[PDB]
């Protein structure tokens, strides 16, 4: 019953660090729409042993302009206090996470046999306002087995204090850390590792090329790469220096790690060990997590004025860029900005094979040979109204045009 | 370039102290773990333990981790590793290395190794 | 020593692919993605040839590759050349910090 099926691979760095994440991007979050929800339905597909097992997770209806967490409300298959594990979070952009955490299992099993159970994949069920079924199915590339509990205290004993606080902002944490080291930046061969500690959770990120080097005059940047499933944001660093007495070398070190889950904890550890060679400096600081609202979790759009004489309107909307001709689905829908009632401002939607449907009022579609979608509006009175159009294909990128019609 | 040595006594008499010293050259400490590897003749080879952190991580092979002890010292660039009541089943080939990536995995430098023989 | 397991020896011709299997446990080998693959000459110290279960160290050809499935790692060794002739050991992270190596492997190059 999905009208567009999605495809992703994830990938597992090292290890995993005590909860597994998974990024949905493709999604559409509509702009300009207070009352524009989803349904989501989300199932994990178990191997256990070599033999299938199914969670289902209802997350009910996503209000994305007022919730931006969600808990699971009910599951099918899962162990007891299960829903408890999971959680999905919006990241703003028209992008959302799906999280679990990973030390204890989700699903009864044998304690004899099955103790270890692995992820094989995740499938997504997303209903926007006019009834399209969006789906996503993304795969473990190289899944591990779970491994309930193994989780020691860990503390480390000599770090310098911090009353910074890093601040975590749709799973991606972002610090400053102002440092001094002896040595000058030419003469400097920088290097940093960061571990965040905290309730179940242990991640650790290194830079692979291992130190800066020879560290330049003004911002420096460099990878980091953290343990375990990677976001297709890269996480990163940046060494500042200062431009050239007995005083040291000023630095400022500004860290972005991008898969950090508030399942850590609120005021779980940031640990920052680095070193500067011509020693061995240590700092540790608390972490918080927002419970802010992104409030910008609208998709991309592409804006563009039409000027009309009368009171009839024509725009065509061109072929997604991965779109080509021949695809075999094609959905273009559309709605007036800020609508009102869910069961009346949502029923312009068009296929390659449908045609206009009878709830549309004052708009009619067409595809022209090409592939190309021509919209005509005949109602428009004399002050200005902006049009809201998406456009999809079964491979392509979902695409949103805000047009904006302006009389003579 | 990274380079290590590792320079031993040769000989320790059963029960008592085998004491190694790694030194490095072409690089630092930094962030990196660095690890002991050992290797009996003509047998396998064995994760000793590593050092990492700082000095704050000492990991240690859960078979050997009474009798072994490994310190730093980076005013000199060497890293150490001690071990108590020896017998001849520590009679081996002892590789110093650099373990770098998460965890230390990759043991990417390795010091030309050392042969200890343990005998009365 | 405590250890992952290997077969003792494998052989192959030059020009063949040859292929090294390396069985752990849930706790060390399926249980991560730290498995690595090394190569040693006699009398030499080993030499990286694989880490991280596929990535491949700079200056290794692309000849040897790794995997891994399940509790299983193998290393797979293509075009096969009489300087390939080694010892080849697989090792694993174990949890806590700790390291697993395996028996060890010994190639043998055919005519």
């Known amino acids: 019953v999905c009208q567009y099926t999605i495809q992703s691979l994830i990938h597992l760095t090292g290890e995993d660090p005590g909860f597994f994440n998974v990024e949905i991007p493709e999604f559409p979050f509509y702009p300009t729409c207070n009352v524009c929800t989803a349904d989501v339905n989300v199932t994990i597909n178990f191997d256990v042993g070599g033999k299938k097992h199914q969670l289902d997770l209802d997350f009910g209806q996503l209000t994305p302009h007022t919730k931006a967490v969600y808990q699971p409300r009910g599951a099918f298959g899962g162990s007891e206090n299960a829903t408890n594990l999971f959680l999905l979070e919006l990241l703003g952009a028209g992008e959302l996470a799906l999280t679990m955490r990973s030390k204890k299992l989700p699903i009864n099993v044998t304690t004899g046999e099955e103790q270890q159970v692995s992820l094989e994949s995740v499938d997504v069920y997303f209903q926007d306002v006019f009834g399209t079924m969006w789906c996503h199915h993304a795969e473990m590339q190289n899944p591990v087995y779970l491994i309930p509990e193994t989780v020691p205290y860990i503390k480390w004993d000599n770090c310098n204090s911090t009353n910074i606080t890093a601040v975590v902002r749709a799973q991606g944490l972002d610090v400053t850390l102002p440092l001094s080291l002896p040595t000058s930046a030419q003469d400097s061969n920088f290097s940093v590792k960061t571990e965040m500690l905290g309730n179940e959770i242990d991640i650790e990120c290194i830079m692979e090329d291992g130190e800066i080097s020879q560290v330049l005059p003004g911002d420096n940047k460099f990878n980091i790469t953290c343990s375990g499933y990677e976001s297709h944001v890269p996480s990163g660093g940046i060494l500042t220096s200062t431009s050239p007495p007995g005083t040291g070398y000023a630095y400022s070190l500004r860290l972005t790690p991008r898969p950090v889950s508030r399942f850590l904890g609120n005021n779980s550890i940031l640990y920052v060990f680095y070193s500067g060679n011509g020693g061995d400096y240590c700092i540790q600081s608390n972490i918080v997590f927002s419970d802010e609202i992104p409030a910008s979790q609208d998709m991309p759009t592409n804006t563009t004025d039409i000027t009309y004489v009368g009171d009839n309107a024509t725009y065509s909307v061109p072929m997604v860029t991965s779109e080509d001709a021949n695809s075999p689905n094609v959905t273009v829908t559309a709605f007036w900005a800020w609508p009102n009632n869910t069961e009346t401002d949502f029923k312009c939607k068009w296929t390659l094979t449908s045609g206009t449907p009878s709830g549309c009022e004052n708009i009619s579609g067409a595809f022209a040979s090409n592939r190309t979608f021509d919209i005509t509006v005949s109602g428009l009175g004399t002050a200005p109204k902006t049009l809201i159009i998406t456009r999809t294909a079964t491979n392509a990128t979902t695409t949103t045009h805000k047009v904006i019609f302006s009389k003579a | 370039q990274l380079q290590l040595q590792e320079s031993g006594p040769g000989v320790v008499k059963p029960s008592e102290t085998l004491s190694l010293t790694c030194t490095i050259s072409?690089?630092?400490?930094?962030?990196?773990?660095w690890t002991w590897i050992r290797q009996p003749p003509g047998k396998g080879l064995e994760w000793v333990g590593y050092?990492?952190?700082?000095?704050?991580?000492?990991n240690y092979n859960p078979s050997l981790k009474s009798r072994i002890t490994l310190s730093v010292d980076a005013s000199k660039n060497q890293f150490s590793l001690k071990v108590t009541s020896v017998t001849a089943a520590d009679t081996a080939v002892y590789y110093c290395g650099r373990a770098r990536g998460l965890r230390g995995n990759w043991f990417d430098v390795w010091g030309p190794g050392v042969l200890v023989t343990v005998s009365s | 020593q405590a250890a992952l397991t290997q077969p003792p020896s494998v052989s192959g011709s030059p020009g063949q692919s040859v292929t090294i299997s390396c069985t752990g446990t849930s706790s060390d080998i399926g249980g991560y993605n730290y498995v690595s693959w090394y190569q040693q000459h006699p009398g030499k110290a080993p030499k990286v040839m694989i880490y991280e279960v596929s990535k491949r160290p700079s200056g290794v050809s692309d000849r040897f590759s790794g995997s891994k499935s399940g509790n299983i790692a193998s290393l797979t060794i293509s075009g096969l050349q009489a300087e390939d002739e080694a010892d080849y050991y697989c090792?694993?992270?174990?949890?806590?910090?700790?390291?697993?190596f395996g028996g060890g492997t010994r190639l043998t190059v055919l005519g």
């Open positions: 050092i990492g952190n700082g000095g704050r991580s000492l």
């Open positions: 072409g690089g630092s400490f930094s962030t990196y773990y």
């Open positions: 090792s694993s992270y174990a949890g806590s910090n700790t390291f697993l």
